[PDB]
Write a protein that holds these residues in place. Structure first.
Motif, mmCIF file in Angstrom:
data_model
loop_
_atom_site.group_PDB
_atom_site.id
_atom_site.type_symbol
_atom_site.label_atom_id
_atom_site.label_comp_id
_atom_site.label_asym_id
_atom_site.label_seq_id
_atom_site.Cartn_x
_atom_site.Cartn_y
_atom_site.Cartn_z
ATOM 1 N N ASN H 90 47.312 29.433 23.438
ATOM 2 C CA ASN H 90 47.220 27.851 23.284
ATOM 3 C C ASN H 90 46.407 27.300 24.383
ATOM 4 N N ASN H 91 46.279 26.039 24.266
ATOM 5 C CA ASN H 91 45.216 25.329 25.233
ATOM 6 C C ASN H 91 45.299 25.456 26.551
ATOM 7 N N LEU H 92 46.776 25.318 27.127
ATOM 8 C CA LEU H 92 47.030 25.342 28.553
ATOM 9 C C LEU H 92 46.503 26.658 29.026
ATOM 10 N N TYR H 93 46.874 27.804 28.405
ATOM 11 C CA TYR H 93 46.460 29.109 28.970
ATOM 12 C C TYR H 93 44.921 29.254 28.739
ATOM 13 N N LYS H 94 44.444 28.701 27.871
ATOM 14 C CA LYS H 94 42.948 28.616 27.963
ATOM 15 C C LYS H 94 42.591 28.062 28.985
ATOM 16 N N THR H 95 42.840 26.876 29.533
ATOM 17 C CA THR H 95 42.416 26.171 30.591
ATOM 18 C C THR H 95 42.668 27.036 31.887
ATOM 19 N N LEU H 96 44.074 27.495 32.220
ATOM 20 C CA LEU H 96 44.368 28.229 33.560
ATOM 21 C C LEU H 96 43.414 29.374 33.914
ATOM 22 N N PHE H 97 43.347 30.375 32.625
ATOM 23 C CA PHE H 97 42.773 31.626 32.923
ATOM 24 C C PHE H 97 41.407 31.817 31.689
ATOM 25 N N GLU H 98 40.479 31.064 32.578
ATOM 26 C CA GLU H 98 39.041 30.910 31.727
ATOM 27 C C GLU H 98 38.016 31.531 32.876
ATOM 28 N N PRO H 99 37.422 32.679 32.280
ATOM 29 C CA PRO H 99 36.452 33.383 33.246
ATOM 30 C C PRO H 99 35.259 32.585 33.342
ATOM 31 N N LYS H 100 34.746 32.734 34.408
ATOM 32 C CA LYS H 100 33.265 32.154 34.928
ATOM 33 C C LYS H 100 32.015 32.940 34.081
ATOM 34 N N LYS H 101 30.890 32.224 33.795
ATOM 35 C CA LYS H 101 30.049 33.004 33.247
ATOM 36 C C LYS H 101 29.416 34.359 34.091
ATOM 37 N N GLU H 102 29.477 34.113 35.168
ATOM 38 C CA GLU H 102 29.099 35.306 36.255
ATOM 39 C C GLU H 102 30.268 35.770 37.004
ATOM 40 N N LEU H 103 31.295 35.780 36.550
ATOM 41 C CA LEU H 103 32.438 36.529 37.241
ATOM 42 C C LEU H 103 32.712 38.035 36.918
ATOM 43 N N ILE H 104 32.321 38.426 35.746
ATOM 44 C CA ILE H 104 32.187 39.934 35.361
ATOM 45 C C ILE H 104 31.008 40.497 36.284
ATOM 46 N N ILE H 105 29.888 39.883 36.328
ATOM 47 C CA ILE H 105 28.909 40.665 36.828
ATOM 48 C C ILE H 105 29.164 40.659 38.589
ATOM 49 N N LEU H 106 29.663 39.518 39.259
ATOM 50 C CA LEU H 106 30.152 39.715 40.431
ATOM 51 C C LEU H 106 31.057 40.554 40.631
ATOM 52 N N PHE H 107 32.240 40.775 39.582
ATOM 53 C CA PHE H 107 32.974 42.008 40.044
ATOM 54 C C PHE H 107 32.624 43.159 39.923
ATOM 55 N N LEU H 108 31.622 43.462 38.834
ATOM 56 C CA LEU H 108 30.845 44.856 38.850
ATOM 57 C C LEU H 108 29.999 45.002 40.299
ATOM 58 N N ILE H 109 29.628 43.860 40.599
ATOM 59 C CA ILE H 109 28.513 44.330 41.985
ATOM 60 C C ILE H 109 29.578 44.479 43.218
ATOM 61 N N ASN H 110 30.665 43.854 43.219
ATOM 62 C CA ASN H 110 31.430 44.026 44.090
ATOM 63 C C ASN H 110 32.288 45.344 43.974
ATOM 64 N N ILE H 111 32.390 45.994 43.009
ATOM 65 C CA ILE H 111 33.023 47.508 42.750
ATOM 66 C C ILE H 111 31.990 48.465 43.285
ATOM 67 N N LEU H 112 30.741 48.032 42.837
ATOM 68 C CA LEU H 112 29.507 48.900 43.327
ATOM 69 C C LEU H 112 29.501 48.943 45.129
ATOM 70 N N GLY H 113 29.683 47.921 45.651
ATOM 71 C CA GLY H 113 29.855 47.784 47.103
ATOM 72 C C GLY H 113 30.841 48.485 47.472
ATOM 73 N N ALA H 114 32.007 48.331 46.863
ATOM 74 C CA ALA H 114 33.171 48.999 47.453
ATOM 75 C C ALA H 114 32.909 50.525 47.305
ATOM 76 N N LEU H 115 32.361 51.191 46.206
ATOM 77 C CA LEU H 115 32.244 52.317 46.031
ATOM 78 C C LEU H 115 31.236 52.796 47.127
ATOM 79 N N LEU H 116 29.825 52.155 47.204
ATOM 80 C CA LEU H 116 29.066 52.858 48.279
ATOM 81 C C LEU H 116 29.868 52.596 49.592
#
Ligand SMILES: CCCCCCCCCCCCCCCCCC(=O)OC[C@H](COP(=O)([O-])OCC(O)COP(=O)([O-])OC[C@@H](COC(=O)CCCCCCCCCCCCCCCCC)OC(=O)CCCCCCCCCCCCCCCCC)OC(=O)CCCCCCCCCCCCCCCCC
Ligand SMILES: CCCCCCCCCCCCCCCCCC(=O)OC[C@H](COP(=O)([O-])OCC(O)COP(=O)([O-])OC[C@@H](COC(=O)CCCCCCCCCCCCCCCCC)OC(=O)CCCCCCCCCCCCCCCCC)OC(=O)CCCCCCCCCCCCCCCCC
Ligand SMILES: CCCCC/C=C/C/C=C/C/C=C\C/C=C\CCCC(=O)O[C@H](COC(=O)CCCCCCCCCCCCCCCCC)COP(=O)(O)O[C@@H]1[C@H](O)[C@H](O)[C@@H](O)[C@H](O)[C@H]1O
Ligand SMILES: CCCCC/C=C/C/C=C\CCCCCCCC(=O)O[C@H](COC(=O)CCCCCCCCCCCCCCC)COP(=O)([O-])OCC[N+](C)(C)C
Ligand SMILES: CCCCCCCCCCCCCCCCCC(=O)OC[C@H](COP(=O)(O)OCCN)OC(=O)CCCCCCCCCCCCCCCCC
Lengths: 164, 216, 276, 114, 76, 64, 89, 469
Positions: H90-116
């Motif tokens: 439903n539209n409300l949960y659409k609005t609350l949890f909407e990922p940003k365009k770059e969020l997944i890339i930032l997540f993976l780069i942060n995972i890379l930093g943590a692993l390093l």
């Protein structure tokens, strides 16, 4: 092709004889079992199949809509990638003497026997200076342990493979 | 227990008290070269609850004593700036209210509810118009907190949410571009927590019915 | 629709060159919205009235447009326009908020499913005298927002007598839908059978076809068409050839899932079928 | 040695800053005519101005791109010594940077008012 | 008037479309991808046919790998 | 035993499926094919872990 | 090292006190990084070792990237883009 | 496997619409799932605690790093499932949890930093990984910048982390000045005995531990956790902590440290007592994480602590994910939403949750009891391993502080359950919308892990004994 530093001789990384501590990329691909290609195809089909199964479990927009061909193709490319990485790692641990490598050991034995008969060097001759050879070997030594993080393969014909 | 106190209300401009007026100040365009006048009274009559009085004149004539100004004619009042000296809180916390209710008789004038809160810039203001529905009679007009519109210098801007954890002052002001006397009688301003859904007009206003509920 | 863009340029030249009567604003706003497809120009046309009034001195916009233009936004679920228009209203020094603006503003928020703003607009309508305040349009929106909550739909129904109102035909229809879509097929029939006795408002075709459409039991669907043959004989027969009746129901081996979950899927599909 | 200098310098300039900052405790209470800004009136009639996101992105992205370019200087000073291994490493470095350059091109993040 | 036909729909048709409609990007990719690809596919050919690679240059003195021999001459 | 480990893993998968059904406010027997899928998956994970355990014991015993 | 350590001390204490002067706090971050780089370069020169200079250039690149990210944060915080979006969609 | 994912995501997200974000995140979810299930055989490299050095002694690889690596992928899969899959359609949960365009890339780069960070063998690699993780996590915190509550937290976190990273670099450069080296391989028993480099390592540990927010520098991260979006808070409060604590455990530079012990005791006391003074859910969970961080910091005072730390970090990661996902699921059962970013704020809003979803309250009760340490849940066993380790080394006062802290924390943990098992007469404005099956399955799997992971205790002990000795 003369090594500059001392290296371990016939070091046992597992319960099987050591074939090559730092096998070449072409070497690893050439020593690849049919089961590893089966793994490659398994992953290459699994990511698109995984996407379809996830779409079936919970449609993005409520109604079941199969993903567009672009997502299928990206998933296919990434599946080939992950399968190739897994196959390379399996072949490497075969080289490291961790898993069963009897056929690979026999092929390796015949291969340097033929190379010595032909009057060549055991692990090649390079375009790189011996210092660069040592640097390449020291960088690529046991680099398969970071397959989860980054890809890195031995593209240098260096003599530091830990053999006699 | 011993946790920070939780409450469903917080009176901002109380009035109805002997002191009351010490809690608020006023600002007209006499700070500029303008001729608008502001003055805050205190009325405590019988047959009712004592209220504050906010009246004056809003002459829009430009200050022919200087030139760098372009538009004048305001008159406002606000709560005293929050005293943050060395150890106290610093500001107000509005993180459990979502509303602000104020009880007032209105007139034809168009007043604005002005809120000052923490903001990187200096002159940013969160302001929502005080919709006076019934003129001349008291109305408890409620304004949702997350509907105020950020303005700097009087210009609508990038609508970023208010920092309800750090709110400084609340006030009512006139920026209406019209001449004439103005008046507004307020007797409280408070922030009220979320009310549960109701399906009656009110207890203060009622219409003829069968009165199914048993009389006390 | 294809040439809707072209109408925008011709509108600009009409105002730059010739002085345009203020009454023509209503036609253009209704044209650039409720007429073909485009609603972006409806907002900009409203913004055009604002810019001229502030700067040039042209006569100001009235509250009639924002009430109308909220209603048009609550049809295409246009989330962007509702936020844009609200903050324009919140800082307006020419027109004010009244009964009509809040009703359509509340309806605009039901379309975009904003549980906070819907309750916010209901508080402002409620705190007003019933003289000017909660009307049948208010109940019409409020019932439509409780479409899948039988408890708040009922307490809304008892709200109508308290505000001093009598339910209308458009008011009854949504109440019949809400009772039907939550599995209360049997209670719906008694409401329709006894509505003409209680209020004197004879059931219409849009009422009876609604009850048939939202009854999702093959036998309960039959009992709906039991009084109709012998109480409303003439006015049914014109629904058989109009294809108004729709026979959507619940699956056979569907007891695996919740019955209440089925009623949500059945009614959600039925809402689309009645949207055009 | 650096730790020692740090530790002993902390109290002296710390007390100096403490004293010079207890000074402003009361000062210029900015009683200026802040009345037209606590209401919402404007006196400019002009000076609106604008800044497309692409403009500030050009200004900001000048810095990482300049760092990317200036990182090439160490390579060109040792190009012969690290010829093939370093050539491959620089190719990978450049391809990784071109991934981000492709990102900024596809997004059209750097196109000023059209 | 002109619409992108899509790279995946046809590779050569998209190549022509990029060469004719987006010259800057097409040429940027052309010269960019030519480098590594031409290197990989031409360096062995150049080594085999054109000329072999030059001998490595010295970096320090070449130290002989032998013991100290007894020499006579230029004594005190 | 391998059979006991598989039974335990399958039971854990069934418990996970039941808990998921109850969290969603759905009847216990909602999607039995989902019960089968969850049991198969968790039994496979249990089999993998049991194989790892057996190899661990083999490695422990071999160095004697 | 004297100059680097004292610059670091002064900038660190300027950061601790203001702490609400985002322009000046971010300036203090830059100056503390400069002070650390000076110490590292001096010790690299004294030891005649390349690792100090390599870490120095790495710190320079990281400082540049950090400055870019921080200035983007300040743009978002202070709304440098401007608005003038009145009378628009 | 991660670098290729990052590159492919930049390329694909560049040429995709905003509506493809969910599909891209799902694609990476299955990608990481296949990475774990298909490349998991690499654990054969670490029989008998075999250790490797990679990239010119710049990285270390052993069973510890491999296990932390796999745990980070599992956590990333769960968190990315929370973004790709829609909780309610439903539209409300659409609005609350909407990922940003770059969020997944930032997540993976942060995972890379943590692993390093986890795999680091050199201070240059350590600092570079720290800076990568820090810049990525700043961008993660700031990517939702439509509120001043989030903006102030982003700016504070940027500045505080900049100071902390500067202090870390200063300590590393002081170490280099002392030894003309950037690696720990030059440190031996003779090196520690002859020269006084203890203060350098104390400063380094201070700077690293303050990044995850131990006392007396806890308030800033607690404010940040309170003010960031909850789907961001669940990630920013787990992964950096895991990376820093794993690096500190593997570094083994704080044997019997008085400063570390005192700071751990202070962290435990502050987390336990300050939790009692909280009426907000986010601040309560922040102090819970502080108390758990103190528990894990108690393990830094002794050697041969790999098993206890690994068990505790895995169980705490599972419990942390479970508790945030329970809080996310409970959003549907409240009558109003606070913010677009933080829809629930006060514990009082969960009042009477047992009348809306009794099994959600059951799962929350299980996770809260595991936090308290009620047997036979995993939390009790992790705390028991911590107690055994600390009593093996003779830290009796530390054990008393640990027990007292757990007893105090139980009060504000049971605060949640007591509030949630109350009676709410206010019926819901929402009904019968079905929650996501995938996310519900993941939450149930986490709950079942917490409930019945003690079955495999002996199996895990044997695997540790064979793969870590
Ligand atoms: C340079 C030096 C060489 C390296 C780089 C080579 C790049 C070559 C690019 C060629 C295509 C250029 C192009 O026009 O692409 C579209 C785009 C511009 O064109 P456009 O038409 O305007 O795009 C807009 C689209 O309409 C809108 O977008 P779209 O819907 O068309 O989708 C775009 C999509 C598609 O974009 C592309 O197609 C571009 C990239 C193609 C990569 C192809 C790799 C294929 C790998 C798998 C091959 C086997 C498959 C399995 C077979 C069965 C096996 C059993 O982008 C992606 O998703 C990126 C690719 C994803 C990862 C692929 C690679 C996986 C890892 C492979 C590892 C190597 C293993 C070696 C094993 C050796 C064994 C001995 O350019 C790029 O995307 C830039 C290049 C991206 C590189 C990655
Ligand atoms: O034929 C040559 C050889 C075939 O067998 P061969 O004739 O016996 O020669 C073997 C040795 O090259 C013979 O010994 P060598 O010393 O002559 O080989 C050393 C090698 C250069 O020395 C190296 O080994 C350099 C490699 C450095 C590290 C590679 C690790 C890969 C890491 C992946 C990137 C992710 C990084 C993670 C980020 C965090 O010398 C070269 O000249 C190779 C460069 C050839 C063309 C330049 C690179 C091709 C394009 C680059 C990307 C492909 C598109 O294969 C190659 O050309 C290998 C180079 C390809 C590298 C792929 C990059 C990934
Ligand atoms: C080492 C130890 C570490 C972790 C242990 C954790 C897990 C064990 C391993 C794997 C777990 C994976 C199991 C796959 C089997 C799960 C399974 O039946 O599918 C799904 C969810 O499926 C995941 O969401 C599958 C999620 C896969 C990833 C789970 C990771 C947690 C559950 O059925 P369900 O009744 O909701 O199925 C759907 C049905 O298919 C649709 O037709 C209906 O429309 C829909 O309403 C619903 O009925
Ligand atoms: C099909 C491939 C899928 C594999 C993906 C695995 C992802 C792991 C991720 C997140 C952690 C979840 C729990 C992992 C269990 C520890 C395994 C192990 O044994 O821990 C040991 C080390 O014990 C330790 O220090 C302490 C571990 C603390 C565990 C705390 C949780 C207890 C409850 C979990 C019980 C499992 C229930 C399964 C039901 C069927 C590592 O073992 P290892 O390094 O020798 O390699 C293992 C072989 N492996 C890679 C194939 C798996
Ligand atoms: C290395 C490259 C260095 C420069 C990087 C330039 C970055 C440009 C990134 C970019 O945006 O490229 C994709 C571009 C987008 O296409 P467009 O239709 O503009 O998309 C609009 C988006 N809404 O797409 C395009 O329009 C350009 C795609 C052109 C691809 C064809 C050229 C590839 C080279 C192949 C031939 C090479 C020479 C012959 C080789 C023979 C042996 C193989």
């Amino acid at each position: 092709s003369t090594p500059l530093v001392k290296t371990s001789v016939n070091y046992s990384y597992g319960d099987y004889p050591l074939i090559d501590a730092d096998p070449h990329f072409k070497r690893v691909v050439g020593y690849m079992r049919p089961s590893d290609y089966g793994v490659i195809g398994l992953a290459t089909a699994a990511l698109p199949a995984g996407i379809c199964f996830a779409e079936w479990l919970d449609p993005v927009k409520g109604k079941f809509a199969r993903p567009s061909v672009k997502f299928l193709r990206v998933a296919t490319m990434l599946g080939f990638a992950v399968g190739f990485g897994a196959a390379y790692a399996r072949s490497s641990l075969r080289f490291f003497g961790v898993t069963e490598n009897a056929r690979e050991y026999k092929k390796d034995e015949a291969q340097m026997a033929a190379r010595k008969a032909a009057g060549l060097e055991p692990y090649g001759t390079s375009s790189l200076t011996p210092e660069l050879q040592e640097i390449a070997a020291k960088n690529s030594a046991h680099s398969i342990a970071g397959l989860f993080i980054f890809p890195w393969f031995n593209f240098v014909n260096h003599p530091y493979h830990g053999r006699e | 227990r011993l946790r920070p106190t939780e409450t469903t209300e917080q009176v901002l401009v109380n009035f109805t008290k002997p002191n009351s007026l010490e809690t608020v100040l006023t600002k007209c365009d006499e700070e500029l070269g303008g001729y608008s006048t502001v003055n805050l009274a205190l009325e405590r009559p019988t047959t009712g609850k004592p209220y504050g009085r906010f009246f004056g004149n809003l002459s829009l004539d430009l200050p022919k004593d200087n030139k760098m100004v372009t538009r004048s004619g305001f008159a406002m009042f606000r709560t005293l700036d929050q005293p943050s000296s060395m150890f106290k809180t610093n500001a107000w916390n509005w993180e459990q209210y979502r509303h602000l209710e104020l009880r007032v008789r209105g007139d034809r004038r168009k007043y604005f509810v002005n809120v000052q809160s923490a903001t990187p810039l200096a002159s940013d203001l969160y302001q929502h118009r005080l919709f006076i529905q019934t003129p001349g009679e008291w109305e408890t007009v409620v304004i949702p907190i997350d509907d105020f519109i950020l303005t700097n210098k009087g210009v609508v801007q990038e609508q970023m949410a208010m920092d309800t954890a750090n709110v400084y002052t609340v006030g009512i002001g006139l920026i209406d571009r019209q001449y004439g006397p103005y008046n507004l009688d307020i007797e409280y301003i408070k922030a009220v927590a979320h009310p549960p859904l109701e399906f009656k007009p009110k207890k203060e206003y009622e219409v003829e019915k069968e009165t199914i509920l048993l009389t006390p | 629709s294809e040439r809707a863009d072209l109408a925008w340029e011709m509108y600009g030249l009409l105002h730059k060159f010739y002085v345009v009567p203020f009454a023509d604003y209503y036609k253009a706003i209704k044209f650039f919205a409720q007429d073909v497809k485009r609603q972006d120009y409806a907002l900009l046309t409203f913004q055009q009235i604002r810019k001229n009034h502030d700067l040039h001195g042209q006569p100001a916009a009235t509250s009639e447009m924002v009430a109308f233009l909220f209603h048009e936004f609550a049809k295409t679920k246009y989330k962007r326009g509702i936020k844009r228009l609200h903050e324009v209203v919140a800082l307006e020094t020419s027109f004010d908020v009244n009964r009509d603006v809040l009703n359509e503003m509340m309806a605009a928020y039901v379309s975009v499913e904003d549980l906070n703003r819907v309750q916010d607009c209901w508080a402002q309508l409620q705190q007003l005298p019933p003289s000017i305040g909660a009307n049948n349009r208010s109940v019409d929106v409020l019932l439509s927002y409780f479409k899948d909550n039988i408890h708040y739909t009922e307490r809304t129904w008892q709200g109508i007598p308290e505000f001093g109102l009598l339910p209308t035909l458009e008011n009854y229809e949504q109440y019949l839908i809400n009772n039907c879509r939550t599995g209360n097929y049997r209670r719906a029939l008694e409401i329709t059978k006894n509505m003409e006795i209680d209020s004197g408002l004879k059931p219409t075709a849009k009422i009876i076809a609604a009850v048939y459409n939202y009854t999702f039991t093959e036998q309960r669907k039959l009992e709906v068409e039991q009084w109709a043959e012998k109480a409303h004989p003439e006015m049914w027969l014109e629904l058989k050839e109009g294809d108004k009746l729709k026979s959507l129901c619940l699956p056979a081996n569907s007891d695996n899932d919740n019955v209440e979950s089925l009623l949500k899927q059945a009614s959600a599909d039925m809402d689309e079928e009645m949207s055009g | 040695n650096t730790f020692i200098i740090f530790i002993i310098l902390i109290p002296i300039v710390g007390f100096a800053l403490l004293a010079v900052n207890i000074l402003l405790a009361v000062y210029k209470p900015y009683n200026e005519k802040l009345g037209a800004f606590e209401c919402g009136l404007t006196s400019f009639n002009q000076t609106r101005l604008a800044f497309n996101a692409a403009f500030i992105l050009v200004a900001i992205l000048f810095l990482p791109f300049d760092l990317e370019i200036s990182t090439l200087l160490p390579y060109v000073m040792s190009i012969y010594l690290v010829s093939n291994y370093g050539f491959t490493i620089v190719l990978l470095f450049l391809l990784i940077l071109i991934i981000g350059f492709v990102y900024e091109i596809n997004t059209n993040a750097l196109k000023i008012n059209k | 008037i002109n619409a992108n036909p899509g790279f995946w729909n046809g590779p050569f048709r998209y190549l022509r479309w990029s060469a004719h409609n987006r010259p800057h990007l097409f040429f940027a990719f052309a010269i960019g991808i030519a480098g590594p690809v031409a290197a990989l596919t031409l360096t062995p050919l150049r080594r085999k046919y054109l000329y072999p690679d030059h001998s490595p240059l010295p970096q320090s003195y070449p130290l002989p790998q032998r013991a100290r021999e007894q020499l006579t001459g230029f004594d005190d | 035993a391998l059979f006991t480990s598989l039974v335990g893993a399958s039971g854990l998968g069934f418990a996970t499926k039941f808990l998921s059904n109850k969290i969603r406010l759905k009847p216990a027997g909602y999607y039995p094919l989902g019960y089968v899928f969850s049991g198969v998956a968790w039994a496979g994970l249990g089999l993998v872990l049991h194989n790892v355990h057996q190899h661990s014991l083999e490695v422990l015993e071999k160095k004697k | 090292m004297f100059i680097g350590t004292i610059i670091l001390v002064l900038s660190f204490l300027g950061f601790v006190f203001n702490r609400r002067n985002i322009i000046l706090a971010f300036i203090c971050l830059e100056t503390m990084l400069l002070g650390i780089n000076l110490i590292l370069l001096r010790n690299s020169v004294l030891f005649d070792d390349i690792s100090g200079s390599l870490f120095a250039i790495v710190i320079i690149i990281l400082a540049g990237v950090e400055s870019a990210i921080g200035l983007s944060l300040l743009v978002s915080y202070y709304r440098l883009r401007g608005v003038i979006n009145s009378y628009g969609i | 496997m991660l670098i290729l994912a990052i590159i492919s995501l930049i390329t694909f997200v560049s040429m995709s619409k905003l509506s493809d974000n969910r599909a891209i995140i799902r694609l990476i979810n299955i990608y990481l799932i296949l990475v774990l299930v298909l490349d998991s055989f690499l654990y054969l490299l670490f029989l008998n605690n075999q250790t490797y050095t990679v990239m010119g002694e710049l990285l270390i690889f052993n069973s510890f790093t491999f296990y932390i690596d796999m745990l980070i992928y599992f956590i990333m899969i769960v968190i990315s499932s929370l973004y790709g899959y829609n909780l309610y359609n439903n539209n409300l949960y659409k609005t609350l949890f909407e990922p940003k365009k770059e969020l997944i890339i930032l997540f993976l780069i942060n995972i890379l930093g943590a692993l390093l960070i986890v795999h680091s063998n050199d201070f240059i690699t350590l600092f570079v990984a720290i800076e990568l993780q820090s810049y990525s996590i700043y961008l993660i915190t700031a990517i939702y910048n439509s509120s001043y509550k989030a903006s102030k937290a982003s700016m504070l976190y940027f500045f505080m982390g900049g100071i902390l990273s500067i202090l870390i670099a200063y300590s590393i450069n002081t170490y280099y000045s002392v030894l003309n080296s950037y690696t720990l391989h030059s440190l031996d028993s003779l090196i520690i005995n002859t020269l006084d480099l203890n203060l350098i390592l104390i400063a380094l540990s201070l700077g690293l531990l303050f990044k995850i927010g131990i006392a007396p520098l806890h308030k800033w991260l607690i404010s940040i956790y309170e003010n960031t979006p909850i789907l961001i808070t669940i990630y920013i409060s787990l992964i950096p902590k895991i990376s820093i604590l794993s690096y500190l455990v593997l570094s083994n530079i704080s044997i019997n440290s008085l400063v570390i012990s005192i700071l751990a005791i202070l962290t435990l006391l502050v987390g336990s007592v300050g939790g009692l003074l909280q009426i907000k859910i986010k601040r309560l969970l922040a102090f819970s994480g502080l108390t758990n961080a103190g528990y894990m910091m108690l393990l830094l005072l002794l050697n041969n602590n790999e098993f206890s730390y690994l068990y505790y970090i895995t169980q705490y990661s599972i419990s942390h994910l479970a508790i945030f996902m329970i809080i996310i699921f409970s959003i549907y059962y409240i009558n109003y939403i606070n913010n677009q970013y933080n829809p629930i704020i006060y514990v009082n809003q969960l009042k009477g949750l047992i009348h809306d979803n009794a099994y959600l309250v059951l799962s929350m009760a299980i996770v809260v009891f595991s936090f308290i340490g009620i047997p036979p849940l995993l939390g009790f066993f992790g705390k028991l391993n911590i107690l055994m380790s600390i009593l093996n080394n003779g830290y009796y006062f530390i054990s008393i502080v640990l027990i007292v802290a757990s007893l105090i924390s139980a009060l504000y943990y049971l605060y949640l359950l007591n509030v949630s098992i109350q009676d709410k007469n206010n019926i819901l404005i929402n009904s019968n919308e079905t929650v996501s099956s995938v996310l519900s399955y993941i939450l149930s799997s986490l709950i079942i892990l917490i409930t019945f992971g003690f079955i495999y205790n002996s199996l895990i002990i044997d695997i540790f004994n064979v793969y870590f000795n």
